[PDB]
Amino acid sequence: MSVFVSGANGFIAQHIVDLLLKEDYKVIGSARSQEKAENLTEAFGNNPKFSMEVVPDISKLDAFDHVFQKHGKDIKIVLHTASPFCFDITDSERDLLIPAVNGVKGILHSIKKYAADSVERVVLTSSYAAVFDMAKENDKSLTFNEESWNPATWESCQSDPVNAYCGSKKFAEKAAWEFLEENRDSVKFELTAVNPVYVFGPQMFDKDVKKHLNTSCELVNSLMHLSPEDKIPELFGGYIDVRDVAKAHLVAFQKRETIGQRLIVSEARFTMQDVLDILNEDFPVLKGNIPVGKPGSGATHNTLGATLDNKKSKKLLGFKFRNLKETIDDTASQILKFEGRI
Amino acid sequence: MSVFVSGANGFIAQHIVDLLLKEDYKVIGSARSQEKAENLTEAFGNNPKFSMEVVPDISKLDAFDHVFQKHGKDIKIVLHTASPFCFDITDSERDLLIPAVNGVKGILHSIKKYAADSVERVVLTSSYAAVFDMAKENDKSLTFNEESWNPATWESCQSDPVNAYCGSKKFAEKAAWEFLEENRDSVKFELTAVNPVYVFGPQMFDKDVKKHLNTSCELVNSLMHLSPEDKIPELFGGYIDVRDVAKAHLVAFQKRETIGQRLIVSEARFTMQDVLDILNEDFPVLKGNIPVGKPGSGATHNTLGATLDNKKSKKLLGFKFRNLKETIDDTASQILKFEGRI
């Protein structure tokens, strides 16, 4: 009853390890170096049921061979949360697209060779970037669901860095499904994809906040630090708390009904205005020091773009998600506690 | 006199090498790998006036020690065009900001250590990203010039990946001027920064087009492959032809008047509509197959944002720049001829 979590030091991944250990699973994780592996096992307080392997570069196809060669008979569940450790914008194909695809193909081929009969479930951390149409998010008449796929092609997505990045998520998820479709009679596992939107919420450990804020929580951090007259960035998307994302990964491998499914983990829509309203209303230390904008004109009070219909995902997952106030509260409070501002 | 060109296989740098050889300089370049080094020397016809050294990682502070130790007495000009390879958007400080700064400090420390009395001129390839205020580029009432610096701070630029990247360019260039200020008595060299906008134009060699289009020319390529009913991306900026950027690097070290200067190399403003108009007007093979948009509504006919005042740079450089028609024509024609469409 052992579970392998790749890139276990990640924002989402640390919460996954946390939940797994609280549910009395044995957990094996990967990090890019011995130091990082040690830091994490120490952070969890040398739990006997938690062990780490070192996997320095997941962009290589043989990266996960040793772990499955050494522990393959013992691993029942694989939660592949790790993404290629770095990328660049020139030669998108060689430096972003190909590594993204191999980053998924490698671990699956490791399973096929050293654990074709023991691994029962694989959950892939995907993204809403593999689902949506970036140019059509603002179209109120449209609806996107679990069956929606990013329309960008291998060639067309290379237009600019942002499109290329979202394209890499599509082709990464596609390679997973393709591997299983073709190797179904050669592997025992079933596959599920978890597709988060913008991920907010507290870091698993308080020390992390200084270095390890993800892209979404960085947006909150910057808002907290803007002057009263500073401009408000224009952003629209779904939001989800990191703990709900972590919980969804467990439900993804635990339930029969999540087999072969893409699960969009999103609670509702937001804009930066919605985040600003919460910051102002909930944090006396910030009130008067940050921008105010136009209170109550964000997506928590209005329909501002395409409908994200993840009712299937919600039904399948079977647990209620944290709202924006709660996730921003926890995110902001943790940063303010790290800054000693209380 | 022997001119050192870091990252000599880059889009701009290949043109710099071409120009230098034509003016009968001896050239030493660097590339991240032996393969790339050998590919470049081959492409230039195994010209014995041109040699290549391997420098895998420019952010390691001893990166360039070997080249300047063995060639320091001979190297009189340094054209630092290389930027860190790879980046990451979660830990922007560790994976983007610090490497950018060290990618500049390293080579300058190498020069101080091994070529303090011989290197006479250093030219840094910086960027208009170090000059502009991204949020104010919109505002017609505002002007940016050679004395303008990106207002983003080390903390504030970390708000998002685009801002972080732009911030990294600021801090890289800042480190260069600071190094010279603090070491003026211990080094001989004078410093010049070249700061390009969006760089369009033909690759030095035709075979490259398949893999090696930079971010800006990738925009042109993507426009050439849109259907008549596709929507056009919304983008505003300055433009410059790659050959003019390359020439400017030579002028930047050849002239006395460019000592201690930041030179913004930009001809005029553009939007994607201006690019579309050129593609439709000059290429029968594209017209009727790509969007038309709203012809003549672009930045070549209208004022659509802040004024880029580089009159000082243009005067100091002393040569006229190619216009948008010219640079897009050459970009598209090379792609079309590579696609056998002519």
Q: Which of A95, A218, A231 sits opposite B158 (nearest CB)?
A: A218
Residues B258, B265: Cα–Cα separation, whole Å: 13
Contact between B251 and B18 under an 8 Å Cβ cutoff? The reply is no
Determine if residue A49 is labeled as part of a ligand binding site: no
Three state DSSP letters for A257-314: HHCCCEEEECCEEEEHHHHHHHHHHHCCCCCCCCCCCCCCCCCCCCCCCCEECCHHHH
CA distance A214 to A201: 10
Q: What are the b/e assignments for A44-75, b being 16+ CB within 10 Å?
A: beeeeebebbebeebbeeebbbebbeebbeeb
| Backbone phi and psi for residue B27, each to the nearest 5 degrees, phi listed first | -125, 135
Residue A213: list chain B partners with CB under 8 A.
90
The approach used to solve this structure was: X-ray
How far, CA to CA in Å, does A109 sit from each of A32, A74, A283?
20, 17, 49
Alpha carbons within 13 angstroms on the beta-carbon side of residue A236 total 20
Dihedrals φ, ψ of B263, to 5°? -115, 110
CA angle A211, A212, A217 (to 5 degrees): 115
Across the interface, which of A88, A159, A225 has its CB nearest the CB of B219?
A: A159
| Angstrom distance (rounded) from CA B240 to CA B45 | 28
Given an 8 Å threshold on Cβ–Cβ distance, is A159 in contact with B93? no
Token code pair at residue B193: 């920064």
A135: chain B residues, CB-CB within 8 Å: 231
Name every chain A residue with its beta carbon within 8 A of the beta carbon of B219: 159-160
Question: What residue ranges in chain A does DSSP mark as E strands?
Answer: 2-6, 26-31, 50-54, 75-80, 121-125, 143-144, 190-196, 198-200, 236-241, 262-265, 268-271, 307-308
Q: How far does the CA of residue B199 sit from the closest CA of chain A (Å)?
A: 13
CB A220 within 8 A of CB A331: yes
| DSSP 8-state secondary structure symbol assigned to residue A94 | I
> Pairing mode, if any, of strands B236-241 and B268-271?
antiparallel
Question: Are B214 and B284 spatial neighbours (Cβ–Cβ below 8 Å)?
Answer: no
Instruction: Show Cβ contacts of residue B42 under 8 Å, excluding neighbours closer than 6 positions.
Output: none
> Residue written as tokens 């790339």?
B36
Which secondary structure element, helix H or strand E, spans residue B177, and what is its range? helix B161-182
Catalytic annotation on A169?
yes
How many angstroms separate the CA atoms of B193 and B180, rounded? 12
Q: Is A335 annotated as a binding residue?
A: no
Query: Which tokens go with B114?
Result: 């091994």
Compute CA A31 distance to the chain's CA centroid, rounded to the nearest angstrom: 16
Closest CB to A85 among B88, B158, B214: B88
3-class SS at B140?
A: coil
Cα distances (Å, whole numbers) of residue A168 to A12, A61, A199: 19, 17, 19
- B39 interfaces chain A, CB cutoff of 8 Å: no
The CA-atom distances, in angstroms, between A82 and each of A5, A173, B136 are: 8, 13, 37
Measured CA angle at A332 (ends A329, A333), to 5 deg: 80
* B58-B94-A275 Cα angle (round to 5): 140
Domains in chain A: boundaries: 1-342
Can you give the resolution of this entry in Å? 2.0
Of the candidates B92, B135, B214, the beta carbon closest to that of A90 is on B214
- How many A-B residue pairs are in contact by the CB < 8 A criterion? 67
The contacts of residue B32 (CB under 8 Å, 6+ apart) are B7, B54, B55, B56, B57, B85
The one catalytic residue in A26, A169, A170, A247 is A169
- Report in angstroms the alpha-carbon separations of B178 from B106, B160, B182: 13, 26, 6
Annotated binding site of B: 7-12, 32, 36, 57-58, 165, 169, 199, 216
Evaluate whether B41 touches B52 at the Cβ level (below 8 Å): yes
Q: How far apart are CA B6 and CA A229, in angstroms?
A: 42
DSSP SS3 for A242: helix
Question: SS3 of A160, please?
Answer: coil
Binding site feature residues of B for NADP(+): 7-12, 32, 36, 57-58, 165, 169, 199, 216
Quick check: A91 and B219 CB within 8 A? no
B201: left (phi over 0), alpha (psi -120 to 50) or beta: left
The answer to whether the Cβ–Cβ distance between A222 and B87 falls below 8 Å is no
Residue A117 CA, chain-centre distance (Å), reads: 28
Q: What are phi and psi of B196, to 5 degrees?
A: -80, 155
DSSP state of B301: T
Q: Is residue A261 within 8 Å of residue A191, measured between CB atoms? A: no
Q: Is the dihedral of CA A42, A48, A53, A58 positive or negative?
A: negative
| Cα–Cα distance for residue pair B230/A243, rounded to 1 Å | 39
Neighbours of B288 (CB within 10 A): 9
Would an 8 Å CB–CB cutoff place B91 in contact with chain A?
Answer: yes
Q: Does domain A1-342 have CATH number 2.60.120.10?
A: no
Instruction: Please give the radius of gyration of chain A, using alpha carbons only, rounded to the nearest integer.
Output: 20
Q: Compute chain B's Rg from CA coordinates.
A: 20
| Test the A interface: residue of B86, B221, B242, B276 with most A CBs within 10 Å | B86
CA-based nearest residue to A63, from A30, A96, A37? A30
Q: DSSP letter for A233, please.
A: P
Instruction: Determine the Cα angle at B153 with ends B149 and B158, to 5°.
Output: 120
CA distance B211 to B326: 23
B135 membership: H or E segment, kind and range: none
Residues of B in contact with A212 (CB under 8 A): 90-91
Residues of A in contact with B90 (CB under 8 A): 11, 212-215
Judge whether B141 is closer than 8 Å to chain A, CB to CB: no
* A155–B225 C-beta distance less than 8 A: yes
> If DSSP codes are grouped into helix, strand and coil, which group holds residue A199?
strand
Residue B54, SS3 per DSSP: strand
Q: Cα(B191)–Cα(A321) distance, rounded to whole angstroms?
A: 56
Q: Select from A41, A121, A31, A44 the least CA-distant residue to A75.
A: A121
